Homo-oligomer: 63 residues x 6
């Protein structure tokens, strides 16, 4: 798995990401947590995003 170190680094370092969804909508926030199926995106509000609904995870700055 490359997924787990990619997300885990962005979570340890508290990097602001943009999570684009498969319908077009972008979301922005810090990655509070994740597991095999979902990512907890902690923003103004902490929301759970299903990976199946995600197209790409983009760090706002080069880490």
């Amino acid at each position: 798995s490359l997924q787990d170190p990619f997300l885990n680094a962005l979570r340890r370092e508290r990097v602001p990401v943009s999570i684009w969804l498969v319908n077009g909508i972008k979301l922005q926030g810090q990655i509070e947590s994740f597991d095999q199926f979902v990512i907890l995106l902690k923003n103004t509000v902490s929301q759970m995003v299903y990976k199946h609904a995600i197209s790409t995870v983009v760090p706002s700055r080069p880490v």
Copy 2:
């Protein structure tokens, strides 16, 4: 299972109202009655069955 399950369980036991957004953009509302590997039973006017595969985000109305 180690983020998704306790997130959805905390919501279910505390009976917190949630916004469940589908991938097609619609926003369902209500309280989580129960959930398994595939579906979430969401209760409001009736108990409706929502397939996880059709959900983008789950948004708790309080932390």
Copy 3:
């Protein structure tokens, strides 16, 4: 895993409750649940049509069961 789908659909079926089945594309199907398996739901209306679970967003009863 199965625990919940089968009892939920069976309750509607046995009680012949009219359901709205919403598709992920926003189209809404209507009718009675005639049967189901792991992947499909047969929805009886003017005809018995086969609906793929993968294309279903929500199953919504018409009356509070």
Copy 4:
């Protein structure tokens, strides 16, 4: 499996069906053949349809 007898009888009896796609498009034709993942829709032209792209299979007449 309920799927196999449903499709098999529409094929044996050569019933014209109106398959539906998860994007909106409807296809019409007879079911020439199928397996676990695809259905062969025989029309003016034969085309293989992936089930994952199908929402519903609707017979044009009550069989």
Copy 5:
């Protein structure tokens, strides 16, 4: 297995031009070079990898 494989193989061996419609409505064109459980390699000006999960229909330019 038994419909999808020999269909995509007869297309590959006979080098028949096909139309691969995606679920988003785009029509890719070209010849099947190879395929496994998940992807189809479609050759035209280059060889592009098309994920089956994103395909609605495969339409051969001849029977």
Copy 6:
């Protein structure tokens, strides 16, 4: 099976790719790495792309 040699060939040769998403948005960059579920695409930043959201991976130069 075919994915790996395809992506590895693009990666090793550092061939720029267009990755089309199922929503029709096109991403661009180099392939850094990939696992069973994701492709790390390096452009201005290293972004993680979910395979489930990809329709087609397209090279810019014929291999």
